Design a protein around this ligand. Structure first.
Ligand code: NDP
Ligand code: NDP
Lengths: 298, 298
């Protein structure tokens, strides 16, 4: 009747994934899996079992991996043999094919389902981008992120010398082109130019319009808001100039969470194997009877 | 290697469906099926066999039904026993559940696939609307058509007394609310008021802001341009005020055609049965190896 979900990692996503599972009337939250188990359990996790190994939790249908991207395959390969299903928001566009081909046979062998790269991008947007391609298979598509924070670029800026803290904003200038607004807390000694030169040198910044500013508090300029403008102009049949846009103004980690819950729900209805969200019927993402949902949405 | 498609009906969709099949390098056009066979074969159908019964055409994988909506079930029930697959743009939102559960067993018994209600709305938009619902399952969605021509309302206006010709434009006023701009050729004798009162009385117009104008030529004001603004404001997990928009500026029948070709291609990869487009992985709509497509779009 209800789906028994365990969350692996209580990072930013984890926090919102609890909120998203708490809100799904068709879900039970078995427990959260942390490196540090129950220790210093935060207030909002009061009413849930927290452990160090998923093996400690009982009758788990699906593991939502709120892990880093580097950590996803390792934890998946670990959690599948147990017969448990694994959704994740793995976000390294370039590796997605190999990570898929990896879990593929392991999923089948253990009669269980892995859905991978299931956030809003990749995930949600990957579906829209694919539908859009189909609507006019000749022409050009453009993915336009922000304004929003970039966990990757934010990190790749902290990493540089003179940089105590740093947040990199990602600003869309259209046609897949972007602007980087980096805000920094200077370590005692170093100057804005040293740091600026040091950032712009890195491949993550060297090919994009970058502006580096110094601020008292990075935390005082942070906000989990984010967006996207997906755009296609192209040809349906041989009829030119067909135009379509998809846009979001969303809370990034809040939405990534909700999609993970959705592909968790969706894994309970697939032939054992590994799946990107473009391989999943979008109706499986929702709660309810196919007939009732078709009546409402088609 | 290639998919052998027959088109049933050389109406406006039919015309564009040829153009769309001509453009799919993974398709072969076996023939067009008309009531009136080859008889006044139009120039652009020169190089294709045209017949009166699909039985005349040979080694057909999939029948694209470019028929009216009233006619779809009849032609499907006819073409399935022959072992052939049936895609259609059946567009009566209310009947879609019954039409599905009708073909369902018939498709299975004959180990073959029917995809139904596969235009841009329903079809394309049915997918986006469903994904959007998933992204924030609490709140409100709004489908906003036009500006574009309305075949249904256009017809329901010709039907009224004093109306020689009539075209009904559909104008979005947001939040699912619409305006009807009806343009009429008066049958010599009748007056604009009589006709106006006579239209607005009808359920198709009585609940919508309607403006009725009299014009010299209806054909002089026609255009197959059209669009939609799909809109959801709602809640991801328990995070409020998540916003997302999907919009098109397209040639209506041109796009309906291209989607039909897409669900024709998609039917070649499904367990026998009846499917709405929300039941089909969006990747199946495209030509190519899953790996190549995932590399590009996810
Ligand atoms: N598709 C999309 O658009 C989005 C996808 N993402 C995905 O989410 C990931 C992280 O999201 P977020 O929650 O904000 O990140 P955080 O860094 O805040 O959280 C990661 C958590 O994973 C757990 N963890 C498990 N194993 C390890 C390990 N070996 N090293 C470090 N931490 C580990 C930790 O929690 P604990 O110690 O309690 O176990 C940690 O808090 C990204 O790497 C990306 O894959 C990110 C944003 C949106
Ligand atoms: N999803 C969406 O928004 C859209 C949906 N549609 C769908 O497409 C349908 C038809 O559009 P379109 O092709 O422009 O319409 P037309 O009226 O221009 O074409 C209908 C064709 O159906 C064939 N036909 C076969 N049997 C019959 C019959 N008994 N009575 C009438 N026609 C018959 C005919 O082909 P021939 O004359 O050569 O024999 C005829 O030309 C709509 O009713 C709707 O279901 C339309 C466009 C957009």
């Amino acid at each position: 009747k209800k789906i028994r979900a365990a969350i692996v990692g209580y990072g930013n996503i984890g926090k919102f994934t609890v909120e998203a599972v708490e809100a799904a009337e068709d879900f039970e939250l078995v427990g959260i899996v942390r490196r540090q188990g129950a220790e210093n359990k935060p207030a909002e996790l009061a009413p849930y079992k927290v452990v160090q190994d998923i093996k400690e939790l009982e009758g788990v249908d699906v593991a939502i991996l709120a892990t880093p991207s580097r950590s996803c395959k390792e934890y998946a390969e670990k959690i599948l043999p147990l017969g448990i299903n694994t959704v994740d928001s793995f976000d390294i566009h370039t590796d997605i094919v190999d990570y898929r081909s990896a879990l593929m046979p392991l999923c089948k062998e253990h009669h269980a389902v892995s859905i991978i790269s299931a956030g809003w991008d990749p995930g949600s947007d990957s579906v829209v981008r694919t539908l859009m391609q189909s609507l006019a298979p000749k022409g050009l598509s453009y993915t336009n992120f922000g304004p929003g924070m970039s966990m990757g670029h934010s990190v790749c800026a902290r990493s540089k010398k003179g940089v105590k803290n740093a947040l990199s904003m990602t600003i869309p200038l259209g046609e897949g082109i972007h602007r980087r607004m980096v805000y920094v807390e200077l370590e005692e000694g170093a100057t804005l130019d040293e740091v600026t030169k040091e950032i712009k040198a890195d491949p993550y910044f060297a090919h994009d319009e970058t502006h580096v500013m110094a601020v008292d508090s990075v935390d005082a300029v942070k906000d989990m808001g984010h967006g996207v403008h997906l755009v296609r102009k192209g040809v349906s049949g041989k009829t030119q100039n067909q135009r379509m846009e998809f846009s979001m103004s969303i809370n990034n980690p809040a939405l990534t969470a909700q999609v993970l819950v959705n592909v968790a729900r969706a894994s309970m209805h697939q032939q054992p194997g590994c799946y990107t969200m473009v391989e999943i019927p979008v109706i499986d993402l929702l709660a309810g009877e196919r007939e009732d949902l078709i009546k409402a949405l088609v």
